C-alpha cells in the first residue's frame, strides 16, 4: 500500500493503483449509453437528483454542431476538458475553416491527459467521456477512460451497473445498422431500463437524448420533447 | 572579388581571385576565398568578410559534429542545406554570395549556389562576385558540355583571367582547387 | 499520516475534498426558497457575546443589484469568491451592456472551485446558495467546495441542514407565495436553532421581479416575529 | 529539476548540525598534509601515495596555484576539490578585472568561504568534503589560512590536516618555533610528513609547493629527491 | 549502518560514507563483460569481447568501441543506457572545444569535462548517478599515447595499461607482474600481451569474431578499429 | 523493499527495481514479433478480442511513424501512443532541418536517449512500453531495431515481444532468413503467431500484419490482409 | 534470508531449516519421496531452498482472468437451486479483481440473501447484492458525481 500513494510509483506487480482508482471513480456516476446507425448516432444519459426539490444533474452537453459528448464521474474535470474541447473545435474552425474530424481530436484528448498521468503531483481526470458525431465518413462512437484509452466501439455503456447494460447491446447489435432514429432511440433506451430498480424507468425528469444525423445537427432533448420518444414502449417483464 | 565553380565527371573544380579591398584601397593582395569545410567539400565566399567567415565557422561546426555522429561521409546537399538555413534565417543582417561544392561518394561532384537572398539551387556551373557580371557572355558560349578536368582548369583559368583583367575590384592572383574521389589538389597561377 | 493532496481514494473518490465537505457541517445553517413570486433567503447569525456588535456579522451579501448571496463555513475564504463574483459580472456588463444570468455567473465562480495545486493552494471550505431573478424568472442555485453546481427549488444548508431539508420537503409545494415561504422558513429556523429568535439572531434577503433589490431592514423582521 | 529548494541541513534538538559534523569526519579521513609560514614565505607539503605502481604521477597534482603568488592545497576527497578550485580561479579573475591588480589573499578566503557557507545553507546539496589551506606573500608578509566544511577559516602559523593531525599537531607545536627559514621549515614539514608517512618516502610519495616574496612556485621531483637527503 | 536516508540518497553516513556510489560501482558489474586497455611505446590498444547469444541479433550493432573524434577512441562498460547517453556528451563538448578554441581537445581535458559533469550527478540529491564507466585513449603531441579512465564517482587518472569490466583485480594482478619487468613495448608486443592477458583471465582461446580491438598509433593518428581478418592474423600470431 | 521506491536510488546491490517492475509489466502483454527478409521487413502482431469489445480494426498497435518507418508496440498502449507522437515529431524535425529521410539508426538513438531521460529522477517514472523499428532503403536496405523500457536499443534480423517470447523466438531461428522473400515470410509468420495463444487462458485473438520493404517502394503500409489471405490458409495447415 | 541476527529467533530456525536442506537434497539422495511446498511471498527465502534440486519446479498462480472467475462461480453454483436465467459471463465481467475464495464467497452469500425473502431459486440481482456485500461498501452522499 505504501507504494500505492503517488502516480510516479510503479507496482511490484506492475500496476499503478492510482489509475485503477480513477477507473473506480467513473463507476459511481449515472449510467448512459451511445450507439450509431449506418447514418445516425444517438446517445442517451440518465439524470440523478440530489433531492426532490433539487433538479436532476444534467449529463449531455453540446460542443459543436457535429460533436456531442456525454459525461460520467467528476464534474471539475468535466468542465475543464470540455472547455479544452470547445477551444479545440473552434481552433481549426478558425484556421482551416472546416470541422474537426473526430479521430485526431480524440487523440488530442488522450495526448492531453497523458502528461499528468506521468508527472509528479498530478492526478488523472475522473471522467467517462462518450463521443459521437460525423467525420466525412459517417458517425462514430468513442469512449474514454482515466487511462486515456480511446476506443472505436459500436456502442458502449459506462457508469453504475453498466455491466448488464452492455448485455442487451450484443443481442440486438445486428439491428443497430438498419433501423432509423424512431425505433433506434427506443432500441438504446431499452438498454438503460435494466440498469435501474424494477419500479421506475424514465419518468420525464431523469433522461436526456443527444443525436447527430446527416442533415441533422447534434441536438439534445430533455423531459419535454423526450415524451414523444418516451411513448411506444413495453413495460418490464418479471 | 570573383568566385568560379564548375563540376565535371570525376569531380568538381573551384577557383577565385585573391584580391581583398576596402573602399578604393587594396586591403589585401592575396586571400583564401576558398574554404575547406570537409575533406571533400569546399565553399567559395563573397560579399562581407566577417559574415562569410563566421558563417563558415559555424557551418563547419554543425556539419563536423553531425558527421561524427553519422559515422559516415557528409552530403554536399546537406551542407548547402545548412547555409540555406542560416542565410535565410538571418537574411536581414548578412551579405553573402556563398557557393558550395565538393565530391561525394554517393553522388560524385556537386555544385550548389547560395546567393545573398537565401535561396538554394544546383547547377552545372556557378559564378559569383562583383566582377562576375563581366563574363556571362564569354562563359556561356565558351562552355561546352562533357569536358575533362584539365579542360575545366583551362576554362576557369581563362574565365577568372578575363574577369580579373576587366574588373577594378578583382585581381591579385588566381587560386584553383580540384576535388575528386582521390583527394584535393590546390595551386596558384598567373596568366 | 501525510499523503498526497492530489491523490484519489483507494476506493477512488478523493482525499481532502471529502474533508472539505465535512468542514461545512460545522458551519451556521441557512435556508433559501425560490418562489414564482420571488426568492427569499434566511440565515442565523450565531451571536456569541453581547459585546460583539451584531451587524458586523453578515451572511447575506449582494453580488449584483439583482443577485444575492448566501455563505456557510470559512467566511474570509468566502470573501475572495465574493469579490471575484462581483468582478466578473461587472466584466460581463462592461463588455455586453446586459446583466449576466445567475447560473452563468456561478459557472464562472465554480470554474476555480477546484484549481488548487503546486505550480502556476488548498481547496476551499464554504458552501453557497445564490438567488437572483433573471429572464427565466427568479433563480436559485446551490454549490459546494467540489465545484458541483446545481439548481434547487428551496435548499437549506448548515449544521442542521439535514432536518432542514427533511422538514422543508414536508412544507414546500410548487405554488408557494412569498410571505408564506417566509414564515414557513422562519418556523424551520426557530425549530432548528437554540437561541430565542429575535431581531438579532437571524436575517433575511428577498429578491423580487418587481422588488428588484433585496431589502431587509430590521423591525420588519420583528414585524414578522410578532406575526409568528 | 522541479525546484524543491528545501535545505537538507537542520539544527539538532540539542542545537547541532549533524551533516556538517559528519562531513568533518570524512575530512578527517582524508590524506594528511601540512604547511608552514616562517619569516620569508610559506611551504606546503602533502601525503600523496599511488595505490598501485601502474598509476601516473605527473598527471594528478595536489599543490595547486591560483595566482602567481597564491598557492593552495587540501585534505579530504579529491573530486570536490577541483570544483571549488575552478570557482576560485574565476573569482580571483573578476577582482583583477575590476581593479587591475592581483587580489590580496584574505579577500580570497573571504569570498571562497562565503561561497562554501552559502552552499552549506542552500537547499538539496550536501556540504563539501574537503578542508583547504592557502598561502601567499602578499605585500612582503606571506599568509597562511585554513578553511573547513563549515565555511570557517583561520590564520595558522603552521598546521596540518588529514590523519593524525593532532599528533603532528603537537609535533608542530614542539619542533616548531616563532621564526625559521624556508629550507628549515621544509625540513620539519617533511619531519611530520614522515611522522605518519609509509615506509619508503620518495619524490613521488609526496609533493611540495612554496610561496616566496618573488611569487608562488611549485617544487619538482628533482629538487624533492634532492632534498630527500637529510631525511625528516 | 543506515541513518535517515543515507541508504536512499546522496548524503553522508555517520561513518562519513555514502552508500549510493559504492552501490553504483558494482552496478557496472551487471554488464557481464570485462575490458582491457594498454599503452605502448608509440601506440595504445583497446580490446574487449562480446556475447552474441542470438543469430537474429545483428553483429555490427553490438560494438562498444566508440569513435569520439578522428584522434580519440573510447570504450564503455556498465549499462548501455548510461554509456550511450555519455557518448553524446563526449562528442558534444568535444565539438564545442573545436568551436571555441580552434585546435583539438586534449584527451586529458575531455576527461576533466566528463568527470566534472559526473560530479553533479553525485552532488545534487535529486538525480541518478549514471552507473557506467568510461575509458579513453589518444595520441598527444609531445606526449605520445595516453589512456584514461572516467568513473561514476567523478575522478580520473593516467595509466600505462589498464583493464576493467568484471576482472579488474585479476587483470591488474597479471599486468603488474607483466609490465614492471622491464618490458620493451612494440606494436605486436602490446597487442599480443593484450590478447594474452584476457585469454588467460577468461581461459577462452577465442575465435577472432567475439572480441573487438581498438587501436591508435603514432604513424596514423586516426583512431582505428580492427577487422577480424587482421585480428585473426594477430591471434595466430600469438598462436605459435 | 525500502529501496525500490524512487527512480533515483540505487539498490544495495546495484540496480533499479522500478525498471525491474516495468520490464515484466511489458512482459505481460500479448505477442508482437518482427522479421526482415533480404529486401524488406515484415511485422506481425497478435491482438485479443475479449468478447465483442469494439468495432474490429480498432486501436491497432501496428503504428506508422514515417512513410518508410514502421512501429511495433507492445506492453502498455497509451504510452506507446505518446512515443509514436515523439517519433513523428522527431522525424519531422529532421526532415525540416536537413531535408531528407531520417536514418533508422539516428531515429532509434534519439528516441532511446529520450527514453533514458525518464529513468534518472523521482519526478517521473519509466515507460511501460516496448516496440520495434522497421525501415527499408535502396541505399541502405532492410534495418530492424528494438527498444526496451530501460533504454537499450539496437538491431536484429528478427525479434519477439510479449508473453510468448522465448518459445516464440525458438522456431523463428528455424527459418532461413537471408534469401527469403518477405512475401513468403508473410504467410510464414502466420504459422508462428498461430501456434501460440490457445484456449483456457484468453479468447479469439486477432492477427494484424504490417509490411514494408522493396515491393512497398520504401513506403510503409499494412499488408493487404483480406487480400490473398494466405496467412490463414497457410496458418492453419499446422493442424498436425 | 539469514543475516547478522542477534540473540534469539533465527538462532534455532536456521538450524532446523539447514537440517531440512541437508535431509532433503545432497548427502544420500533418495527417490522414494516427493516434496510439495507452497507459500505466499517468495522474497524471504534462501537460495539453497530454491536452488534447482531441493525445489525443482516453480509454479506461480495468477488470479482468474475472466472465464476462470465465471466458471468458478459456476462451480460453487452447483449445489444451489438456480433460476436458469443467469449469465456467468455477466457475473464474471462484473466480478473484477477477485479470487477463487471470494468468487466462492459471493455464491455463498447469495443463497442466504435469497433465504432472507425465503425464495427458492436465485436471481442475477441476488448475485449483484452478494457482490455488494463482498465489496464492503462504506457510505453514502457520494452523489456529486455524474
Spatial CB neighbours of B136, under 8 Å, sequence gap ≥ 6: none
Q: How far is A43 from A212, CA to CA, in rounded Å?
A: 9
Query: Using CA of residue G18, residue G23, residue G28, residue G32, what is the dihedral sign?
Result: negative
* C-beta neighbour count of C14 within 10 angstroms: 21
**For residues E67 and E204, is the Cβ–Cβ distance under 8 A?**
no
Superfamily covering domain F1-240: Aminohydrolase, N-terminal nucleophile (Ntn) domain (3.60.20.10)
For residue A197, the chain G residue with the least C-alpha distance is: G125
Q: What gap in Å lies between CA C39 and CA C32, rounded to an integer?
A: 7
Give per-residue burial for F68-98: e unless 16+ CB within 10 Å, then b. bbbbbbbbbbbbbbbbbbebbebbeebeeeb
Question: Would you call C148 and G144 a contact, using CB atoms and an 8 Å cutoff?
Answer: yes
Contacts of G75 (CB under 8 A, 6+ apart): none
Start-to-end CA span in chain D (Å):
53
Q: What gap in Å lies between CA A74 and CA A70, rounded to an integer?
A: 12
> Angle, to 10 degrees, between the axis of helix D105-121 and the axis of helix D78-99?
130
The resolution, in Å, is 4.1
Cα→Cα distances C9→A1, A8, A23, A90, Å: 12, 16, 11, 36
* F96 in reach of chain B (CB within 8 A): no
**Residue D2 sits at the chain F interface (C-beta within 8 Å):** yes
Q: Which three cell numbers stand for residue E31?
A: 554488464
Each domain of chain F, given as residue ranges in start order, spans: 1-240
Give the whole-angstrom CA distance, residue G102 versus residue G79.
17
Residue in D26, D53, D59 closest to E180 by CB: D53
| Contacts across the C-G interface (CB distance below 8 Å) | 6
| Closest CA relative to residue A16, chosen from F124, E209, C75, F84 | F124
Give the SS3 label for residue F222: strand
Chain A residues close to C152, C-beta within 8 Å: 50-51, 53-55
Which residues 6+ apart lie within 8 Å of F15 measured at CB? E27, E30
- Calpha distance E1→E14 (Å, rounded): 8
Instruction: Check if B1 is active-site.
Output: yes
Q: What distance in Å separates the CA atoms of residue D110 and residue A19, rounded to the nearest whole number?
A: 54
| CA–CA gap between residue G67 and residue G73 (Å, rounded) | 10
Which residues in chain F have Cβ-Cβ distances shorter than 8 Å to E28? Answer: 14
Which whole-number Å values give the CA distances from A176 to A34, A179, A230, in the listed order?
11, 6, 19
User: DSSP code of A53?
Assistant: S
Asked if D49 has any chain E CB less than 8 Å from its own CB, the reply is no
How far apart (Å, rounded) are the C-alpha atoms in residues D219 and D201?
16
d(CA A123, CA E67): 45
The partner residue sitting opposite D54, judged by closest CB among E11, E112, E160, is: E160
Residues of B with CB under 8 A from a CB of F: 69-70, 77-78, 81, 85, 106
Probe site for chain C from A76, A86, A128, A159 (most C CB atoms < 10 A): A76
Q: How far apart are CA B55 and CA B45, in angstroms?
A: 10
Chains G and A touch (3+ CB pairs under 8 A): yes
Residue E238: C-alpha distances to residues B85, E193, E197 (Å): 55, 9, 12
What is the number of other CB atoms lying within 10 angstroms of the CB of residue A215? 5
Residues of chain G with Cβ-Cβ distance to C148 below 8 Å are 144
Question: With an 8 Å Cβ cutoff, is E86 touching chain F?
Answer: no
Helix residue ranges, H only, chain D: 18-28, 78-99, 105-121, 167-175, 182-196, 221-228
Q: Let me know: does B11 contact B181? Beta carbons within 8 Å.
A: yes
A11 close to F (CB below 8 A)? yes
Q: Which residues are CB-neighbours of A80 under 8 A, at least 6 positions away?
A: A125
Report the gap between the CA of A206 and the closest CA in chain C (Å): 14
Residue of F nearest to E19 (CA): F12
Q: Which residues of chain F are within 8 Å of residue B78 when distances are taken between CB atoms?
A: 98-100
User: Residue B107: exposed, middle, or buried by beta-carbon count in 10 A (0-12, 13-18, 19+)?
Assistant: exposed
Chains touching E, CB cut-off 8 Å, 3+ pairs = B, D, F
What span, in angstroms and rounded, lies between the C-alpha atoms of D82 and E112? 10
Helix C75-96 and helix C102-111, axial crossing angle in degrees, nearest 10: 120
Distance of CA E2 to the CA centre of its chain: 33
Cite the DSSP H helix spans in chain A. Answer: 17-27, 76-95, 102-114, 162-170, 181-192, 226-230
Of A37, A38, A104, A34, which is closest to residue A69 (Cα–Cα)?
A34
Report the distance separating Cα A42 and Cα A85, nearest Å: 20
Which residues of F are less than 8 Å from A17 in CB distance? none
CB within 8 Å of chain F, chain E residues 127-146: 127-131
Judged by DSSP in three states, B168 sits in coil
CB of G102 within 8 A of CB of G134? Answer: yes
User: What whole-number distance in Å separates Cα of residue F45 and Cα of residue F60?
Assistant: 9
The distance between the two most distant Cα atoms of chain C, rounded to a whole number of Å, is: 56
Chain F nearest-CA distance from E196, in A, is 30
- Report whether F134 contacts F36 (CB < 8 A): yes
Rounded to the nearest angstrom, the minimum Cα separation between C11 and chain G is: 9
Q: What's the rounded Cα separation, in Å, for the pair D123 and A95? A: 47
Q: Are A48 and A30 in contact (CB under 8 A)?
A: yes
Radius of gyration of chain A (CA): 18
Residue from C225, C204, C224, C226 nearest C215 by CA: C204
Give the 3-state secondary structure of residue A159: coil
- Dihedral, CA atoms, D158, D160, D166, D170, nearest 10 degrees? -30
State the residue for C-alpha cell 556557378. B126
Find, among F225, F226, F209, the residue nearest to F62 by Cα: F209
DSSP class of D60:
S
User: Burial, C95: exposed, middle or buried (Cβ in 10 Å; 0-12, 13-18, 19+)?
Assistant: exposed
CA distance B82 to B71: 19
Q: Give the count of alpha carbons within 13 A of A202, CB side only.
A: 28
- Cα separation of A116 and B62, whole Å? 36
HSE (side-chain half, CA atoms, 13 Å) at B77 = 9
The verdict on E34 touching B (C-beta cutoff 8 Å) is: no
Q: Measured between CB atoms, does D98 come within 8 Å of chain E?
A: no
Chains that touch A (3 or more CB pairs under 8 A): C, F, G
Q: Is A108 helix (H, G, I), strand (E, B) or coil?
A: helix
* CB contact (8 A) between residue E95 and residue B57: no
**Cβ B18 vs Cβ B179: under 8 Å:** no
Count how many pairs of residues, chain E against chain F, have C-beta atoms within 8 Å: 89
Neighbour-count burial of F215, counting CB atoms closer than 10 A to its CB (0-12 exposed, 13-18 middle, 19+ buried) = middle
Task: Return d(Cα A188, Cα A141) in angstroms, integer.
Answer: 14
Disruptive mutation site among E9, E13, E21, E56 for chain F (greatest number of F CBs within 10 Å): E56
For residue F134, which phi and psi values (nearest 5 degrees)? Answer: -105, 130
C154 alpha-carbon distance from chain centroid: 11
CATH superfamily label, D1-232: Aminohydrolase, N-terminal nucleophile (Ntn) domain (3.60.20.10)
What residues of A are in contact with residue F59 (Cβ under 8 Å)? 149-152
Q: Give the Cα separation of A176 and A153 in Å (integer).
A: 13
The Cα–Cα gap between E160 and D52 comes to 12
Q: First CA to last CA across chain B, in angstroms? A: 17
Contact E160, E146 (CB under 8 A): no
Distances (CA, A) of C46 to B114, C54, C200, E98: 84, 9, 9, 78
Q: What's the half-sphere exposure (Cβ side, CA atoms, 13 Å) at D55?
A: 15
Whether F116 and E131 lie within 8 Å, measured CB to CB: no
The C-alpha atoms of residue A89 and residue A106 are separated, in whole angstroms, by: 11
If phi > 0 it is left, if psi is from -120 to 50 it is alpha, else beta; for residue A176 that is alpha
Q: How far is CA A132 from CA A136, A169, A213, in A?
A: 13, 17, 10
Q: By C-alpha distance, which of D75, D85, D119, D115 is closest to E123?
A: D119
**Sequence ranges of the domains in chain D:** 1-232
* Cα distance between residue E188 and residue D222, in whole Å: 34
Method: cryo-EM
Q: Are A66 and A41 in contact (CB under 8 A)?
A: no
Provide, as residue numbers in chain E, all residues whose Cβ is less than 8 Å from the Cβ of B69: 88, 91
User: How far is C-alpha F210 from the geometric centre of its chain's CA atoms?
Assistant: 10
Q: Residues of G numbered 18-37 whose beta carbons fall under 8 angstroms of chain A's beta carbons: which are they?
A: none
| Helices B76-89 and B49-70: angle between axes, nearest 10 degrees | 130
Q: Most B CBs within 10 Å: which of F93, F94, F99, F101, as the mutation test of the B interface? A: F99
D contacts of F123 (beta carbons < 8 Å)? 1-2
Contact partners, residue C136, CB within 8 Å, separation at least 6: C101
C-beta neighbour count of F2 within 10 angstroms: 11
**Cβ–Cβ < 8 Å for C49, C188:** no
Cα–Cα distances in angstroms (integers) from residue D187 to residues D137, D176, D190, D228, in the given order = 20, 11, 5, 9
Q: Which stretches of F44-163 are DSSP H helices? A: 78-98, 104-117
Give E69→chain B minimum CA distance, Å.
7
Grid coordinates standing for C192? Answer: 432548528
Q: CB count, 10 Å around CB of F116?
A: 21
DSSP state of A137: T
- Evaluate whether F152 touches F102 at the Cβ level (below 8 Å): no
Cell 458517425 maps to which residue? A139
- For chain D positions 19-38, those within 8 Å of chain E (CB to CB) are 19, 22-23, 25-26, 29
Backbone angles phi, psi at E125, to 5 degrees: -105, 25
Amino acid at each position: 500500500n505504501q507504494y500505492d500513494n503517488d502516480v510516479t510509483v510503479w507496482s511490484p506487480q506492475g500496476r499503478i493503483h492510482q489509475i485503477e482508482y480513477a477507473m473506480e471513480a467513473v463507476k459511481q456516476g449515472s449510467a448512459t449509453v451511445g450507439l450509431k446507425s449506418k447514418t445516425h448516432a444517438v446517445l442517451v444519459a440518465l439524470k440523478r437528483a440530489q433531492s426532490e426539490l433539487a433538479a436532476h444533474q444534467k449529463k449531455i452537453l453540446h460542443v459543436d454542431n457535429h460533436i456531442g459528448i456525454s459525461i460520467a464521474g467528476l464534474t471539475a474535470d468535466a468542465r475543464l476538458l470540455c472547455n479544452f474541447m470547445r477551444q479545440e473545435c473552434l481552433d481549426s474552425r478558425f484556421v482551416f475553416d472546416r470541422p474537426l474530424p473526430v479521430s485526431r481530436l480524440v487523440s488530442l484528448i488522450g495526448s492531453k491527459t497523458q502528461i499528468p498521468t506521468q508527472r509528479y503531483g498530478r492526478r488523472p481526470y475522473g471522467v467517462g467521456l462518450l463521443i459521437a458525431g460525423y467525420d466525412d465518413m459517417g458517425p462514430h462512437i468513442f469512449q474514454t477512460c482515466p487511462s486515456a484509452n480511446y476506443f472505436d466501439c459500436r456502442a458502449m455503456s459506462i457508469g453504475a451497473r453498466s455491466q448488464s447494460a452492455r448485455t442487451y447491446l450484443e443481442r440486438h447489435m445486428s439491428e443497430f445498422m438498419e433501423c432509423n432514429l424512431n425505433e433506434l432511440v427506443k432500441h438504446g433506451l431499452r438498454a438503460l431500463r435494466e440498469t435501474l430498480p424494477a419500479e421506475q424507468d424514465l419518468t420525464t425528469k431523469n433522461v436526456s437524448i443527444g443525436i447527430v444525423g446527416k442533415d441533422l445537427e447534434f441536438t439534445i432533448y430533455d423531459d419535454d420533447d423526450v415524451s414523444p420518444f418516451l411513448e411506444g414502449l413495453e413495460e418490464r417483464p418479471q | 572579388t570573383t568566385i568560379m565553380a564548375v563540376q565535371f565527371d570525376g569531380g568538381v573544380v573551384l577557383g577565385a581571385d585573391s584580391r581583398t579591398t576596402t573602399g578604393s584601397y587594396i586591403a589585401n593582395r592575396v586571400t583564401d576565398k576558398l574554404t575547406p569545410i570537409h575533406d571533400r567539400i569546399f565553399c567559395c565566399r563573397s560579399g562581407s568578410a566577417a559574415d562569410t567567415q563566421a558563417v563558415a565557422d559555424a557551418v563547419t561546426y554543425q556539419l563536423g559534429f553531425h558527421s561524427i555522429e553519422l559515422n559516415e561521409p557528409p552530403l554536399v546537399h546537406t551542407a548547402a542545406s545548412l547555409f540555406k538555413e542560416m542565410c535565410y534565417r538571418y537574411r536581414e543582417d548578412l551579405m553573402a554570395g556563398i557557393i558550395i561544392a565538393g565530391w561525394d561518394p554517393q553522388e560524385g561532384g556537386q555544385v550548389y549556389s547560395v546567393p545573398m537572398g537565401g535561396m538554394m539551387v544546383r547547377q552545372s556551373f556557378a559564378i559569383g562576385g562583383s566582377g562576375s557580371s563581366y563574363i556571362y557572355g564569354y562563359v556561356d558560349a565558351t562552355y561546352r558540355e562533357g569536358m575533362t578536368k584539365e579542360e575545366c582548369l583551362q576554362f576557369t583559368a581563362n574565365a577568372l583571367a578575363l574577369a580579373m583583367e576587366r574588373d577594378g575590384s578583382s585581381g591579385g592572383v588566381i587560386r584553383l582547387a580540384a576535388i575528386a574521389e582521390s583527394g584535393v589538389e590546390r595551386q596558384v597561377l598567373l596568366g | 499520516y501525510d499523503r498526497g493532496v492530489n491523490t484519489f481514494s483507494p476506493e477512488g473518490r478523493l482525499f481532502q475534498v471529502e474533508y472539505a465537505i465535512e468542514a461545512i457541517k460545522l458551519g451556521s445553517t441557512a435556508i433559501g426558497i425560490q418562489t414564482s413570486e420571488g426568492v427569499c433567503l434566511a440565515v442565523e447569525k450565531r451571536i456569541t457575546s453581547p459585546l460583539m456588535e451584531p451587524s458586523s456579522i453578515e451572511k447575506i451579501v449582494e453580488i449584483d443589484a439583482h443577485i444575492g448571496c448566501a455563505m456557510s463555513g470559512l467566511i474570509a475564504d468566502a470573501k475572495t469568491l465574493i469579490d471575484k463574483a462581483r468582478v466578473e459580472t461587472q466584466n460581463h456588463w462592461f463588455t455586453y451592456n446586459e446583466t449576466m444570468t445567475v447560473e452563468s455567473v456561478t459557472q464562472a465562480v465554480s470554474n476555480l472551485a477546484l484549481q488548487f495545486g503546486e505550480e502556476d493552494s488548498r481547496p476551499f471550505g464554504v458552501a453557497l446558495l445564490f438567488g437572483g431573478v433573471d429572464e427565466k424568472g427568479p433563480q436559485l442555485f446551490h454549490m459546494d467546495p467540489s465545484g458541483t453546481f446545481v439548481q434547487c427549488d428551496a435548499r437549506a444548508i448548515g449544521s442542521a441542514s439535514e432536518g432542514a431539508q427533511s422538514s422543508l420537503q414536508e412544507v414546500y409545494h410548487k405554488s408557494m407565495t412569498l410571505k408564506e415561504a417566509i414564515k414557513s422558513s422562519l418556523i424551520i429556523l426557530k425549530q432548528v436553532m437554540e437561541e430565542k429568535l429575535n431581531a438579532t439572531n437571524i436575517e433575511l434577503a428577498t429578491v423580487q421581479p418587481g422588488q428588484n433589490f433585496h431589502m431587509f431592514t430590521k423591525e420588519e423582521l420583528e414585524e414578522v416575529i410578532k406575526d409568528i | 529539476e522541479r525546484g524543491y529548494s528545501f535545505s537538507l541541513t537542520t539544527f539538532s534538538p540539542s542545537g547541532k548540525l549533524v551533516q556538517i559534523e559528519y562531513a568533518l569526519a570524512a575530512v578527517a579521513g582524508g590524506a594528511p598534509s601540512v604547511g608552514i609560514k616562517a619569516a620569508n614565505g610559506v611551504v606546503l607539503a602533502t601525503e600523496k601515495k599511488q595505490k598501485s605502481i601502474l598509476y601516473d604521477e605527473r598527471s594528478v597534482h595536489k599543490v595547486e596555484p591560483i595566482t602567481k603568488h597564491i598557492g593552495l592545497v587540501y585534505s579530504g576527497m579529491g573530486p570536490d576539490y577541483r570544483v571549488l578550485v575552478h570557482r576560485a580561479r574565476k573569482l580571483a579573475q573578476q577582482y583583477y578585472l575590476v581593479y587591475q591588480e592581483p587580489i590580496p589573499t584574505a579577500q580570497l578566503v573571504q569570498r571562497v568561504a562565503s561561497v562554501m557557507q552559502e552552499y552549506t545553507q542552500s537547499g538539496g546539496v550536501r556540504p563539501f568534503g574537503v578542508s583547504l589551506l592557502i598561502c601567499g606573500w602578499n605585500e612582503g608578509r606571506p599568509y597562511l589560512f585554513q578553511s573547513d566544511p563549515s565555511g570557517a577559516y583561520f590564520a595558522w602559523k603552521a598546521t596540518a590536516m588529514g590523519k593524525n593531525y593532532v599528533n603532528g599537531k603537537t609535533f608542530l607545536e614542539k619542533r616548531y618555533n616563532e621564526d625559521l627559514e624556508l629550507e628549515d621549515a621544509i625540513h620539519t614539514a617533511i619531519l611530520t610528513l614522515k611522522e605518519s608517512f609509509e615506509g619508503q618516502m620518495t619524490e613521488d610519495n609526496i609533493e611540495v609547493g612554496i610561496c616566496n616574496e618573488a611569487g608562488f612556485r611549485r617544487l619538482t621531483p628533482t629538487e624533492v629527491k634532492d632534498y630527500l637527503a637529510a631525511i625528516a | 549502518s543506515s541513518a535517515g536516508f543515507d541508504r536512499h540518497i546522496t548524503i553522508f553516513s555517520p561513518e562519513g560514507r555514502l552508500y549510493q556510489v559504492e552501490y553504483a560501482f558494482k552496478a557496472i558489474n551487471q554488464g557481464g563483460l570485462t575490458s582491457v586497455a594498454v599503452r605502448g611505446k608509440d601506440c595504445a590498444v583497446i580490446v574487449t569481447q562480446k556475447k552474441v547469444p542470438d543469430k537474429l541479433l545483428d553483429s555490427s550493432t553490438v560494438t562498444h568501441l566508440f569513435k569520439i573524434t578522428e584522434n580519440i577512441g573510447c570504450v564503455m562498460t556498465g549499462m548501455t543506457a548510461d554509456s550511450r547517453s555519455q557518448v553524446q556528451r563526449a562528442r558534444y563538448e568535444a565539438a564545442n572545444w573545436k568551436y571555441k578554441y580552434g585546435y583539438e581537445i586534449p584527451v586529458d581535458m575531455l576527461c576533466k569535462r566528463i568527470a566534472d559533469i559526473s560530479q553533479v550527478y553525485t552532488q545534487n540529491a535529486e538525480m541518478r548517478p549514471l552507473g557506467c564507466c568510461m575509458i579513453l585513449i589518444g595520441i598527444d603531441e609531445e606526449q605520445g599515447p595516453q589512456v584514461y579512465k572516467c568513473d561514476p564517482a567523478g575522478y580520473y587518472c593516467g595509466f600505462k595499461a589498464t583493464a576493467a569490466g568484471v576482472k579488474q583485480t585479476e587483470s591488474t594482478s597479471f599486468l603488474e607482474k607483466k609490465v614492471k619487468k622491464k618490458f620493451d613495448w612494440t606494436f605486436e608486443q602490446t597487442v599480443e600481451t593484450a590478447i594474452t592477458c584476457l585469454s588467460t583471465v577468461l581461459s577462452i582461446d577465442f575465435k577472432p569474431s567475439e572480441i573487438e580491438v581498438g587501436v591508435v598509433t603514432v604513424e596514423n593518428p586516426k583512431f582505428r578499429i580492427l577487422t577480424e581478418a587482421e585480428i585473426d592474423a594477430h591471434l595466430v600470431a600469438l598462436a605459435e | 523493499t525500502g529501496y525500490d521506491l524512487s527512480a533515483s536510488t540505487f539498490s544495495p546491490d546495484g540496480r533499479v527495481f522500478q525498471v525491474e517492475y516495468a520490464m515484466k509489466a511489458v512482459e505481460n502483454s500479448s505477442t508482437a514479433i518482427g522479421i526482415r527478409c533480404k529486401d524488406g521487413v515484415v511485422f506481425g502482431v497478435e491482438k485479443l478480442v475479449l468478447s465483442k469489445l469494439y468495432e474490429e480494426g480498432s486501436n491497432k498497435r501496428l503504428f506508422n511513424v514515417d512513410r518508410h518507418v514502421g512501429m511495433a508496440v507492445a506492453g502498455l498502449l497509451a504510452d506507446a501512443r505518446s512515443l509514436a507522437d515523439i517519433a513523428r515529431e522527431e522525424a519531422s524535425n529532421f526532415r525540416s532541418n536537413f531535408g531528407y529521410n531520417i536514418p533508422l539508426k539516428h531515429l532509434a538513438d534519439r528516441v532511446a536517449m529520450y527514453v533514458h531521460a525518464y529513468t534518472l529522477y523521482s519526478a517521473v517514472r519509466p515507460f511501460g512500453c516496448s516496440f520495434m523499428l522497421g525501415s527499408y532503403s535502396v541505399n541502405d536496405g532492410a534495418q530492424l531495431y528494438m527498444i526496451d523500457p530501460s533504454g537499450v536499443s539496437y538491431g536484429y534480423w528478427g525479434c519477439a515481444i510479449g508473453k510468448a517470447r522465448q518459445a516464440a523466438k525458438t522456431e523463428i531461428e528455424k527459418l532461413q532468413m537471408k534469401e527469403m522473400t518477405c512475401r513468403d515470410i508473410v504467410k510464414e509468420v502466420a504459422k508462428i503467431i498461430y501456434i501460440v495463444h490457445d484456449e483456457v487462458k484468453d479468447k479469439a485473438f486477432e492477427l494484424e500484419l504490417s509490411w514494408v520493404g522493396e515491393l512497398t517502394n520504401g513506403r510503409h503500409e499494412i499488408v493487404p490482409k483480406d487480400i490473398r489471405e494466405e496467412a490463414e490458409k497457410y496458418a492453419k495447415e499446422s493442424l498436425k | 534470508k539469514r543475516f547478522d541476527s542477534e540473540k534469539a529467533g533465527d538462532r534455532e530456525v536456521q538450524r532446523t531449516m539447514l537440517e531440512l536442506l541437508n535431509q532433503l537434497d545432497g548427502f544420500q539422495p533418495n527417490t522414494q519421496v516427493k516434496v510439495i511446498a507452497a507459500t505466499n511471498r517468495v522474497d524471504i527465502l534462501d537460495p539453497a531452498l530454491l536452488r534447482s534440486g531441493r525445489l525443482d519446479r516453480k509454479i506461480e498462480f495468477p488470479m482468474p482472468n475472466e472465464e476462470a472467475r465465471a466458471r468458478i462461480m459456476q462451480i460453487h453454483s452447483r449445489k444451489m437451486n438456480v433460476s436458469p436465467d443467469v449469465n456467468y459471463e455477466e457475473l464474471a465481467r462484473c466480478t473484477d479483481d477477485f479470487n477463487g475464495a471470494q468468487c466462492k464467497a459471493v455464491c455463498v452469500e447469495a443463497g442466504m440473501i435469497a433465504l432472507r425473502r425465503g425464495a427458492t431459486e436465485l436471481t442475477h440481482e441476488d448475485y449483484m447484492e452478494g457482490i455488494l456485500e463482498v465489496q464492503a461498501k462504506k457510505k453514502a452522499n457520494l452523489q456529486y458525481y455524474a
